[PDB]
Enzyme design. Structure first.
Site, short mmCIF file in Angstrom:
data_model
loop_
_atom_site.label_atom_id
_atom_site.label_comp_id
_atom_site.label_asym_id
_atom_site.label_seq_id
_atom_site.Cartn_x
_atom_site.Cartn_y
_atom_site.Cartn_z
N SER A 102 0.83 -1.20 0.00
CA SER A 102 0.00 0.00 0.00
C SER A 102 0.87 1.26 0.00
O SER A 102 1.94 1.28 0.61
CB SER A 102 -0.93 0.01 1.22
OG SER A 102 -1.87 -1.04 1.15
N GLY A 103 0.39 2.29 -0.68
CA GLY A 103 1.08 3.57 -0.74
C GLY A 103 0.47 4.60 0.19
O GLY A 103 -0.67 4.44 0.64
N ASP B 295 8.41 14.77 -1.89
CA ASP B 295 8.47 13.72 -0.88
C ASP B 295 9.59 12.74 -1.18
O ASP B 295 9.40 11.52 -1.12
CB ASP B 295 7.11 12.99 -0.79
CG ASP B 295 6.98 12.11 0.45
OD1 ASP B 295 7.79 12.25 1.39
OD2 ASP B 295 6.06 11.26 0.47
C1 614 Z 1 5.37 1.48 -8.61
C2 614 Z 1 6.09 0.16 -8.52
C3 614 Z 1 6.17 -0.67 -7.45
C4 614 Z 1 6.94 -1.79 -7.82
N1 614 Z 1 7.30 -2.91 -7.06
C5 614 Z 1 7.12 -3.03 -5.67
N2 614 Z 1 6.60 -2.07 -4.97
N3 614 Z 1 6.41 -2.14 -3.59
C6 614 Z 1 5.81 -1.00 -2.89
C7 614 Z 1 6.19 0.34 -3.54
C8 614 Z 1 5.43 1.50 -2.87
O1 614 Z 1 4.02 1.24 -2.89
C9 614 Z 1 3.61 0.04 -2.22
C10 614 Z 1 4.27 -1.17 -2.90
C11 614 Z 1 6.77 -3.24 -2.88
O2 614 Z 1 6.60 -3.28 -1.67
C12 614 Z 1 7.35 -4.39 -3.59
C13 614 Z 1 7.72 -5.58 -2.94
C14 614 Z 1 8.25 -6.62 -3.67
C15 614 Z 1 8.66 -7.91 -2.99
N4 614 Z 1 9.72 -7.70 -1.99
C16 614 Z 1 11.04 -7.33 -2.56
C17 614 Z 1 11.89 -8.56 -2.92
N5 614 Z 1 11.97 -9.48 -1.78
C18 614 Z 1 12.84 -10.62 -2.11
C19 614 Z 1 10.63 -9.94 -1.37
C20 614 Z 1 9.77 -8.75 -0.94
C21 614 Z 1 8.42 -6.51 -5.04
C22 614 Z 1 8.06 -5.36 -5.71
C23 614 Z 1 7.52 -4.28 -5.00
N6 614 Z 1 7.30 -1.62 -9.07
N7 614 Z 1 6.78 -0.41 -9.53
#
Ligand code: 614
Length: 228
Positions: free
Chosen positions: A17-18, A115
């Site tokens: 979530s953002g 931000d």
């Molecule tokens: C725009 C946008 C967002 C993304 N990717 C990801 N965004 N976010 C947040 C970004 C901010 O808004 C909420 C989501 C994560 O939290 C996340 C988590 C993962 C998985 N993790 C990282 C790798 N580990 C090995 C496992 C756990 C992959 C990709 C993401 N691409 N473009």
């Protein structure tokens, strides 16, 4: 153009979530991040390899969503903390350089981030860092007092981000909003992280000059960071 047909998207799973953010597929082949809730037109024109790319907007959906470049390693804040102890100084510098390149592009394009923090940067293939989503602990004195934004207030934030990067995801001023306001107002500055050289720390401190006019522009910071 700017419009993606809803049938071109597949919702795979919530990734955070953002508000809500999903991993999805675009035309069944490509991973994308789907962000569900004329500014979007400006956003798509902002194309740089160190900015998370907006691919399009899905209008024919409620609520409307934005389709972004997928960044496999998630938030820089999270990535620094999980990988803490594995970073060489040179890699951390490269991460700052990535962000600075993205920010220099935005500066040149007359776009204020507002931000900038490690939480709003994303990590991709080969540990590339990209700026995304273009909070007193990241705010310049003129911002938290008077809401006076500029690329120079972004520069302040970038100094704090540099600190986040070189401290491997530590929380800056780990204090209340009122206390950070009063710390900064009086001249207090974040101490040097172990992995930051004397040279890097002086760059950081230059980002934290009280007056926006005394801070370097991202164009200048980029030259300085590349010269190391
Ligand atoms: C725009 C946008 C967002 C993304 N990717 C990801 N965004 N976010 C947040 C970004 C901010 O808004 C909420 C989501 C994560 O939290 C996340 C988590 C993962 C998985 N993790 C990282 C790798 N580990 C090995 C496992 C756990 C992959 C990709 C993401 N691409 N473009």
């Amino acid at each position: 153009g700017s419009v993606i047909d809803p049938s071109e998207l597949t919702f795979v799973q919530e990734i955070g979530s953002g508000g809500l953010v999903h991993l999805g597929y675009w035309l069944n082949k490509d991973k994308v991040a789907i962000k569900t809730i004329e500014e979007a037109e400006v956003m798509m024109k902002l194309s740089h390899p160190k900015l998370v790319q907006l691919y399009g907007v899905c209008l024919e959906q409620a609520p409307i969503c934005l389709v972004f470049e997928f960044m496999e390693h998630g938030c820089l804040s999270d990535y620094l903390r999980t990988q803490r102890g594995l970073f060489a100084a040179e890699t951390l510098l490269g991460m700052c350089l990535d962000v600075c390149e993205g920010m220099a592009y935005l500066e040149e394009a007359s776009v204020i981030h507002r931000d900038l923090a490690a939480r709003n940067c994303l990590v991709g293939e080969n540990q590339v860092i990209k700026v995304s989503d273009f909070p007193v602990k990241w705010a310049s004195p003129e911002v938290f007092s008077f809401s006076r934004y500029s690329s120079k207030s972004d520069v302040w934030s970038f100094g704090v981000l540099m600190w986040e990067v070189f401290s491997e995801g530590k929380i800056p001023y780990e204090r209340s909003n009122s206390e950070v306001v009063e710390d900064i107002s009086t001249g207090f500055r974040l101490y040097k992280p172990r992995l930051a050289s004397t040279h890097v720390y002086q760059i950081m401190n230059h980002c934290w000059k009280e007056r926006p006019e005394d801070r370097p522009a991202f164009s200048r910071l980029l030259r300085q960071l590349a010269a190391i």
